[PDB]
Amino acid sequence: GPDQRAQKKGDIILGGLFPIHFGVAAKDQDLKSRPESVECIRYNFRGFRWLQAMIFAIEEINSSPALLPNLTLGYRIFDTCNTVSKALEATLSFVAQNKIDSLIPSTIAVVGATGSGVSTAVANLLGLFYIPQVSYASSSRLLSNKNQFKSFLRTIPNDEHQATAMADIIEYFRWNWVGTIAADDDYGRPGIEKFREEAEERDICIDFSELISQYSDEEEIQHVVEVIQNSTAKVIVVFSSGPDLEPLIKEIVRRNITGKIWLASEAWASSSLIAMPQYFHVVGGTIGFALKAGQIPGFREFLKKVHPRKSVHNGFAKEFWEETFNCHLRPLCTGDENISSVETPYIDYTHLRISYNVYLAVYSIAHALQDIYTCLPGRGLFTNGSCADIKKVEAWQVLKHLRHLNFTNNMGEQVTFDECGDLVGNYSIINWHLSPEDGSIVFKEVGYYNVYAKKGERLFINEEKILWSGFSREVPFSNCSRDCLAGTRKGIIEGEPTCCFECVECPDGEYSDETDASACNKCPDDFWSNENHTSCIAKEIEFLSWTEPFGIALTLFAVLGIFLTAFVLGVFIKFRNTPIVKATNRELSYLLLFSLLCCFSSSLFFIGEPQDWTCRLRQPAFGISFVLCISCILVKTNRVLNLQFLLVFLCTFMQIVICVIWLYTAPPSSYRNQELEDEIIFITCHEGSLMALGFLIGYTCLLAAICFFFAFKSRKLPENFNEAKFITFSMLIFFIVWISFIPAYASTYGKFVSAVEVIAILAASFGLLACIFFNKIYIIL
Amino acid sequence: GPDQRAQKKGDIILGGLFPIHFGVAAKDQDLKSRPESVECIRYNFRGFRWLQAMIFAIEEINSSPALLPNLTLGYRIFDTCNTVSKALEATLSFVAQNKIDSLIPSTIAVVGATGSGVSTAVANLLGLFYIPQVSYASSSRLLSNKNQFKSFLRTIPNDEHQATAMADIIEYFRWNWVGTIAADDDYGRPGIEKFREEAEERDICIDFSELISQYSDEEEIQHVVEVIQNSTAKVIVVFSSGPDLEPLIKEIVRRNITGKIWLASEAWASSSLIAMPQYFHVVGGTIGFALKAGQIPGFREFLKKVHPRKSVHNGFAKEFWEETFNCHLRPLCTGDENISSVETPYIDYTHLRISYNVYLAVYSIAHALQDIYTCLPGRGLFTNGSCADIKKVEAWQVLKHLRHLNFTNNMGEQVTFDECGDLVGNYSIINWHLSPEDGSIVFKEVGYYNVYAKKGERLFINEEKILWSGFSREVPFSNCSRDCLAGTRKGIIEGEPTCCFECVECPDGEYSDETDASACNKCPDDFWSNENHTSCIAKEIEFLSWTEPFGIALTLFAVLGIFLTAFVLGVFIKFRNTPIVKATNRELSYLLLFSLLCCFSSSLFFIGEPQDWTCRLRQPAFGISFVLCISCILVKTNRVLNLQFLLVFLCTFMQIVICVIWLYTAPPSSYRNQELEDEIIFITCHEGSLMALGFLIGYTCLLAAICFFFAFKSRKLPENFNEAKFITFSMLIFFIVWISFIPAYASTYGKFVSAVEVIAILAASFGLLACIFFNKIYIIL
Ligand SMILES: *[C@@H]1O[C@H](CO)[C@@H](O[C@@H]2O[C@H](CO)[C@@H](O)[C@H](O)[C@H]2NC(C)=O)[C@H](O)[C@H]1NC(C)=O
Ligand SMILES: *[C@@H]1O[C@H](CO)[C@@H](O[C@@H]2O[C@H](CO)[C@@H](O)[C@H](O)[C@H]2NC(C)=O)[C@H](O)[C@H]1NC(C)=O
Ligand SMILES: *[C@@H]1O[C@H](CO)[C@@H](O[C@@H]2O[C@H](CO)[C@@H](O)[C@H](O)[C@H]2NC(C)=O)[C@H](O)[C@H]1NC(C)=O
Ligand SMILES: *[C@@H]1O[C@H](CO)[C@@H](O[C@@H]2O[C@H](CO)[C@@H](O)[C@H](O)[C@H]2NC(C)=O)[C@H](O)[C@H]1NC(C)=O
Ligand SMILES: CC(C)CCC[C@@H](C)[C@H]1CC[C@H]2[C@@H]3CC=C4C[C@@H](O)CC[C@]4(C)[C@H]3CC[C@]12C
Ligand SMILES: CC(C)CCC[C@@H](C)[C@H]1CC[C@H]2[C@@H]3CC=C4C[C@@H](O)CC[C@]4(C)[C@H]3CC[C@]12C
Ligand SMILES: CC(C)CCC[C@@H](C)[C@H]1CC[C@H]2[C@@H]3CC=C4C[C@@H](O)CC[C@]4(C)[C@H]3CC[C@]12C
Ligand SMILES: CC(C)CCC[C@@H](C)[C@H]1CC[C@H]2[C@@H]3CC=C4C[C@@H](O)CC[C@]4(C)[C@H]3CC[C@]12C
Ligand SMILES: CC(C)CCC[C@@H](C)[C@H]1CC[C@H]2[C@@H]3CC=C4C[C@@H](O)CC[C@]4(C)[C@H]3CC[C@]12C
Ligand SMILES: CC(C)CCC[C@@H](C)[C@H]1CC[C@H]2[C@@H]3CC=C4C[C@@H](O)CC[C@]4(C)[C@H]3CC[C@]12C
Ligand SMILES: CC(C)CCC[C@@H](C)[C@H]1CC[C@H]2[C@@H]3CC=C4C[C@@H](O)CC[C@]4(C)[C@H]3CC[C@]12C
Ligand SMILES: COc1cccc([C@@H](C)NCCCc2ccccc2Cl)c1
Ligand SMILES: COc1cccc([C@@H](C)NCCCc2ccccc2Cl)c1
Ligand SMILES: O=C(O)[C@@H]1Cc2c([nH]c3ccccc23)CN1
Ligand SMILES: O=C(O)[C@@H]1Cc2c([nH]c3ccccc23)CN1
Ligand SMILES: *[C@@H]1O[C@H](CO)[C@@H](O)[C@H](O)[C@H]1NC(C)=O
Ligand SMILES: *[C@@H]1O[C@H](CO)[C@@H](O)[C@H](O)[C@H]1NC(C)=O
Ligand SMILES: *[C@@H]1O[C@H](CO)[C@@H](O)[C@H](O)[C@H]1NC(C)=O
Ligand SMILES: *[C@@H]1O[C@H](CO)[C@@H](O)[C@H](O)[C@H]1NC(C)=O
Ligand SMILES: *[C@@H]1O[C@H](CO)[C@@H](O)[C@H](O)[C@H]1NC(C)=O
Ligand SMILES: *[C@@H]1O[C@H](CO)[C@@H](O)[C@H](O)[C@H]1NC(C)=O
Ligand SMILES: [Ca+2]
Ligand SMILES: [Ca+2]
Ligand SMILES: [Ca+2]
Ligand SMILES: [Ca+2]
Ligand SMILES: [Ca+2]
Ligand SMILES: [Ca+2]
Ligand SMILES: [Ca+2]
Ligand SMILES: [Ca+2]
């Protein structure tokens, strides 16, 4: 394989795949000359630390007598440069003896790779030969498919939980308008698809979805930047690694776009390529995910013991030395430099997360080998309970024992792989802060995601520790439309997702008391809308009331009429012996005064809240009383022109028969009219039979016409102090009053119709009383 | 490599990857023993025809002297079984000489593979060594990435156009509620993502998105089936191959789900695994995509010449013979059977689409080799214009010449590969019909998709040829919500996409004239909504018009009053010498009659449409005329009790000063009241100065009260035929009329206030005229 390698000899050989370089020289091969091996350029100190973690774990296993006694573990580790081609050359180097026996030391297991696409490409070849491959950083769900990848296992948790956690985070901060960026590889696309599913099931709308790569052209990056700028959303979920996101972040920094709230996947939430101070105005305040940190005692000293000459087995130490001190072995370096003197990710780390994954992968392979070594003859996992010979062990046997692995960590936790080869683990939630002393970016832990917890309780966040955009304490607004107040209702904007709405105020008569009201709820039948439609208020019920001032005035006038009638009646009764009261029919005078009292009592009926009996006894009472009084006047005129009682009885009986008829057929009834005024309910009365009202007033006015005619025929005659002209005057007053209020009765449907009726009754009764009796009162004085 | 192979020797060797089997055995090893090579189960006759197409193209090239003279093409073709593992074993067989020179005949180029995931896995290894790989059926966009796949080219069009075409088809048939199913591989996921993008830009809502596979468990298939059933959407877009869709179709057939409209991607739109008659109730009427058919003259005869013994180079002919006739060489077969006797996809084909792609790939490699062979010494593609030695040709040189390929087909078309190695091509659109004679499924061409055409013109469909569900001629309904009629407006349903809406009728005063009205438009102030709210009609304007019957009646009474006043005036002028008219002031009588004429003319003012001058000259005219009348009556009474003209002038001048004052300060104006009734606009008049109106009526009624008082003081006195009582009567009639209509003026704001005012004016004028002059007329007779 490649010349640059870390090789050690042993009984069992472990393969190693690490990204010692971030990527390869970006150039299009001309194919004019024979193509040579591409050279990867940017040194990755963190990847070299991962390689050192693998070597340290192997050395610790070799030193420990408890684990794999009398057996020596060796390694063959190559640099992938985050590239499929280099990893495939290394894998072809691994499977040389398998290829010879299908178409150099034998490779029992392989550790790696980092990238999910690289791991998929390597896993195809490795599972072709059933060589177990335990990856430390590849987290794509596509690798969980065991039909495709038979020998692939993971010490890193699967990516589905991370997308669910991002959806939970967006829900927690109450956002529904977000953008998505994904790396165009096996890491970005499945994760972003899972996030899209989880966001749509949480009613979260995604404005844009874009794909990026480290090989994206200038036009693609410009298009993505334009899409980001053109959007209102400021929360962008990014599923990518450092190298695949670096060009986009660089272009955003050049254009200097600030205000975006970045949600970071684990691959770049701790990336040194993205977390640099000069990008902090763009990427500051980023909220991202980190793996659970682990402890590897003695690892730091082993890292500090690195040396070009002393590390003879590790061939990558040469370039690490040359890149750390910028020397060559460009100034020549003696080799006596100090690692602690230079600040690189190699030593400048706080938590071991992927390095712990490498350590766990190596120890998992070692524990599988130990389970093979300690297998009791009749209790094996293979056919008939047989056990593999550790001296002549085969890769498929180690894979079989890895599928059944259960071992305790140095941290006292149980490591197991499921049917998909996944190792579930918690997440920590970090926020990108700026250091005051140094100015570098500090990853402050602000929360966690508990995968073991049930749905809805997995997320915990300390929002007080969060600095939005790196400096702000207020949660930013990332909704498409403002949640407008009550009294309004949401409405569709064509061609736009449901999260974006225009809210129109409620229609008159409909109320909305809730923010984000889908529709304006209607008020009930007896209620109406508020002034701003933020509530519902009872409809005002209106009629002619007793306590209201005008009803009081009408009642006082009715009582005054009753008092005057009683006064005249008392004057007549106490002084019945005088010739003046003897001239007129004093019995008929008493009956007429009683009729006037009944008339005023009937006038009292119209005032007040309408009721069934009240509307049933308003027209009939006045009709009876006024027919009776006109009949008494009629018999007085006929005397002027026993039997008089018979005539008044005949008239009152005809009128009361009419009344009984139309009260038996169709009683008047109280009804709550609601169509005249929307806000106001009019309590009024249905007559029931309108032709009955015609008959009633026709009879009253016909008896009136007869009385007026007979009084006119004898107007000039002086008798009983010429009462004929007074009768004529009272009756013409009756006709003036009742004709004059026809405009009043016409179309004035409200609380004032009862007032008009009361005033008409009072006027007619007062005119009759005055004309009949006030002349006699003047005579008596 | 694998023992079962098709091998021929030659100077230049072409690799071959074909799916002779549909898959592998479902033997998921428990790793009890050493895992053996997996056995392939279901024979694929169409894949064997593709392999025969490759062999036929190679043989035709060898026979043709024009193409590659004195050079013999050989092949090494293996069976992939649509599996990554076996394809990778074959690819490792291809790259043996490369692996020997990086860590058996040399492979110059490889044809294949079919599946996109298989092609990706093979292309990683092949591009590691820059061995050109021309695929005939893998259409994933992921393979267009030349950073990852350096040596990969395609004779099949890329899948982006097909997803765009499906979006265009959904738009054409007016659907917005569709479901999506995709194979969980490199073919299904990118295509379904492209379709999701193209549908979201076209306002198409996707109810569900599911993933399937040939290895999907029972629970996954049941979940997908329940998702399909639970959905209202009837159109389902499927990006999958036959084997990956077969379990889902089988389960849907078991449950007998009918009514769905399947949109088929090219991989399964012509699949024999899905297009079987016993599934026609479920998959009948499917609309799918096919590639351009090609012509390979002599191919059918070569296919019919297949034989186990005679085809010594083709090792796959043995199992083809055994599967075709169900024999062994299970009854023994002599080998003298006839291919045409048995109906298999091998010969029972109508159009060569993938076989033509295989043929084109072989001729593309051959033409690249020919371009190498005919290279002029100083005009090469390589360094310094050098040309490759065809005798010692290398794979990377052939790849370089393939990247620059221009050659003419046997059909007379130009074959070229772009920078991504893609060959663009048209699509045909087919519909799954049922044959009447045979009962098999017939793929009827119903349209095409022209990739060369501009956007919006690429799709052509003959809907008359389409049988929906296999039997129906009516386009099915696949919208989430009914597009309800006009008069209604759409409204949001919470938690649901914009395509699903509840439409509420428009509010009163608002109209929607369009289907799918986003909001109800309020039409202008003079308009009010229709009863259906489909439009809005003009607001009715209400006033007291001349043509109205009641306005006509009022005009007739006014004209009658004018006629009566003129008659009295004529009687007075013609007979001025009589003693009766000499007794009264004849000049004052003429003035009073003229004032009555002015009063009737003022009564005529209120009738008609209000106008600024009309509302300005309504109250003043009547006020001045009636005060002049009362002043003449006043001087007549004062005579009853020169200077009379002075008194009438004083009174009329006081009132005219009041009038000039309040028409100078604030004149009355015509206004269109729109608040009393929503549907109707009342045209009425603002007085302007209400206190000035108080002054006007106060002065008129005060001059009245003075006249009434003075006439009452001299009521009994007989003079001028005792005109005093008649004056008192006219004046009391004035007071009765004007007091009586106070209820009428109160709150009766409409077209009837002018009517009431006209009636009051007519009544007062008639009373005055009658009382003053009709007694004199009676005396004159
Ligand atoms: C942004 O929009 C979301 C969704 O409408 C709002 O979240 C809602 O908040 C209210 C009150 O807290 C809850 O009753 C709803 O259930 C939430 N809807 C969800 C979770 O879908 C959020 O408040 C908005 N943020 C703003 C306007 O700043
Ligand atoms: C994953 O995270 C959860 C929550 O942080 C851990 O549960 C906590 O465990 C500690 C002790 O280890 C308790 O004091 C807390 O009360 C627990 N919190 C809960 C249950 O909400 C859990 O142990 C973590 N798992 C791993 C494997 O680290
Ligand atoms: C289903 O809904 C779609 C909405 O997209 C309707 O298609 C629209 O029809 C109107 C007709 O006036 C066109 O103006 C729009 O341009 C169409 N929208 C498109 C094509 O996206 C379709 O008519 C509905 N089908 C029904 C109700 O059967
Ligand atoms: C793709 O399809 C279009 C339309 O079917 C083809 O254009 C047609 O070409 C024929 C001649 O070959 C003309 O008679 C038609 O009028 C054309 N139709 C158009 C322009 O709409 C086009 O040639 C096809 N491209 C191929 C086969 O490569
Ligand atoms: C009550 C409303 C609806 C109808 C009005 C009825 C009026 C117009 C009718 C009914 C009674 C009638 C009067 C009955 C008696 C007399 C006396 C007679 O010597 C002259 C006619 C005269 C003066 C009539 C005039 C018209 C009259 C007053
Ligand atoms: C509309 C109603 C309520 C109010 C009308 C009041 C009327 C009906 C009353 C009030 C004053 C009354 C007048 C008082 C004086 C006279 C003069 C006398 O020689 C004949 C009766 C006559 C003419 C009365 C007729 C009726 C009269 C005008
Ligand atoms: C002077 C002559 C006409 C006799 C007087 C009769 C008067 C008192 C009565 C008889 C008929 C009545 C009219 C009948 C119709 C209406 C329409 C109504 O919506 C308003 C009142 C109004 C306009 C009335 C006004 C007064 C009226 C004209
Ligand atoms: C109709 C409503 C508005 C008012 C009713 C009061 C009127 C009609 C009543 C109350 C007092 C009555 C007056 C009492 C005294 C006299 C004096 C007598 O020599 C002529 C009748 C006359 C003048 C009466 C006319 C009618 C009269 C004025
Ligand atoms: C229409 C507005 C002005 C209200 C009407 C006011 C009425 C109630 C006033 C104004 C003119 C007044 C009359 C003026 C003249 C007389 C004659 C006198 O010997 C007795 C009082 C009497 C009969 C007054 C009665 C009340 C009266 C009619
Ligand atoms: C009843 C006798 C003693 C007096 C008669 C006066 C009459 C003709 C006049 C004077 C004041 C007038 C009232 C003034 C106020 C209103 C309120 C209005 O919305 C309806 C008409 C109504 C109810 C009028 C009814 C008739 C009325 C009472
Ligand atoms: C104008 C509306 C109110 C209709 C009322 C008509 C009144 C105002 C007019 C019309 C005809 C007139 C009558 C004509 C004839 C006479 C006879 C005379 O000896 C007494 C006056 C008297 C009785 C007049 C009274 C007023 C009168 C009745
Ligand atoms: C005239 O003498 C009367 C005899 C009986 C009753 C009454 C009064 C109490 N009712 C006025 C009924 C009101 C009215 C008038 C005209 C048209 C419709 C309507 Cl609803 C008067
Ligand atoms: C009474 O003698 C008059 C002198 C001048 C004018 C008039 C008439 C033409 N105007 C009625 C004005 C109507 C009215 C009455 C009371 C309250 C409000 C309103 Cl709006 C009469
Ligand atoms: O699967 C993948 O592609 C990513 C690669 C990756 C992860 N975390 C990282 C940290 C540093 C460098 C690389 C990574 C998570 N899985
Ligand atoms: O890339 C892929 O996976 C599919 C495989 C495929 C296509 N068309 C076919 C016809 C028959 C059999 C298989 C196929 C289109 N591309
Ligand atoms: C974004 O808006 C700018 C300004 O008009 C425009 O130039 C650019 O094309 C837009 N991009 C997209 C993706 O709409
Ligand atoms: C970038 O934008 C910020 C505004 O947030 C501004 O303070 C800063 O000066 C800008 N930097 C450059 C180089 O323009
Ligand atoms: C591993 O062993 C522990 C006991 O030390 C046990 O609790 C745990 O369940 C085991 N793991 C599995 C997967 O059985
Ligand atoms: C379909 O709907 C039924 C009824 O609500 C429910 O029980 C079932 O779980 C649903 N299935 C799916 C796949 O959503
Ligand atoms: C399957 O469905 C079709 C169409 O609805 C119907 O004709 C047929 O009888 C059904 N068969 C069974 C077994 O339900
Ligand atoms: C291929 O050659 C033809 C002429 O034979 C020419 O028209 C066409 O443009 C060429 N294609 C390319 C890609 O150069
Ligand atoms: Ca790696
Ligand atoms: Ca050891
Ligand atoms: Ca990184
Ligand atoms: Ca949209
Ligand atoms: Ca294949
Ligand atoms: Ca030849
Ligand atoms: Ca198929
Ligand atoms: Ca939803």
From Swiss-Prot, chains A, B:
Any idea which positions bind L-tryptophan?
Answer: 116, 137, 139, 266
Q: What is the effect of changing residue 721 to A?
A: Abolished G(s)-, G(q)- and G(i)-mediated G-protein-coupled receptor activity
According to the record, mutating residue 160 to K results in: In HYPOC1; increased G-protein coupled receptor signaling pathway
Q: Impact of altering residue 147 to D?
A: In HHC1; decreased G-protein coupled receptor signaling pathway
- Residues with attached carbohydrate: 70, 230, 256, 338, 384, 406, 426, 479, 532
Spell out which residues lie on the membrane's Extracellular side. 1-548, 607-612, 666-689, 749-752
Instruction: State what changing residue 90 to T does.
Output: In HHC1; decreased G-protein coupled receptor signaling pathway
Reported effect, residue 139 to K? Reduced calcium-induced G-protein-coupled receptor activity
Q: Which residues cross the membrane?
A: 549-574, 587-606, 613-636, 643-665, 690-709, 726-748, 753-774
- What does UniProt say on post-translational modification here? Ubiquitinated by RNF19A; which induces proteasomal degradation.
UniProt keywords (A-Z) are:
Calcium, Cell membrane, Disease variant, Disulfide bond, Epilepsy, G-protein coupled receptor, Glycoprotein, Membrane, Metal-binding, Phosphoprotein, Receptor, Signal, Transducer, Transmembrane, Transmembrane helix, Ubl conjugation
Gene Ontology molecular function terms on file: amino acid binding; calcium ion binding; G protein-coupled receptor activity; identical protein binding; integrin binding; phosphatidylinositol-4,5-bisphosphate phospholipase C activity; protein homodimerization activity; protein kinase binding
Changing residue 159 to K: what effect? Reduced calcium-induced G-protein-coupled receptor activity
Region annotated Cysteine-rich (CR), chain positions: 480-550
Annotated localization: Cell membrane
Q: How does the protein's chain sit in the membrane according to the entry?
A: Multi-pass membrane protein
Inhibition and activation profile? In resting state, adopts an open conformation, anion-binding promoting the inactive configuration. Upon aromatic amino acid-binding, the groove in the extracellular venus flytrap module is closed, thereby inducing the formation of a novel homodimer interface between subunits. Calcium ions stabilize the active state by enhancing homodimer interactions between membrane-proximal domains to fully activate the receptor. Upon activation, the homodimer adopts an asymmetric configuration of the 7-transmembrane region that primes one protomer for G-protein coupling.
Q: What does the UniProt record report as the effect of altering residue 114 to I in this chain?
A: Reduced calcium-induced G-protein-coupled receptor activity
Q: Where is this site: Important for ability of agonist AMG 416 to activate G-protein-coupled receptor activity?
A: 420
**What is recorded about the domains?**
The extracellular regions of the homodimer interact in a side-by-side fashion while facing opposite directions. Each extracellular region consists of three domains, LB1 (ligand-binding 1), LB2 and CR (cysteine-rich). The two lobe-shaped domains LB1 and LB2 form a venus flytrap module. In the inactive configuration, the venus flytrap modules of both protomers are in the open conformation associated with the resting state (open-open) and the interdomain cleft is empty. In addition, each protomer contains three anions, which reinforce the inactive conformation, and one calcium ion. G-protein recognition is mediated by the intracellular loop 2 (ICL2) and the C-terminus, which contribute differentially towards the binding of the 2 G-protein subtypes G(q)/G(11) and G(i)/G(o), resulting in distinct CASR-G-protein interfaces. The C-terminus confers selectivity for G(q)/G(11), while it contributes less to G(i)/G(o)-coupling. The C-terminus adopts opposing orientations for G(q)/G(11) and G(i)/G(o)-coupling.
Its recorded name reads Extracellular calcium-sensing receptor
Species name: Homo sapiens
User: Fragment boundaries within the full protein?
Assistant: 21 to 861 of 1078
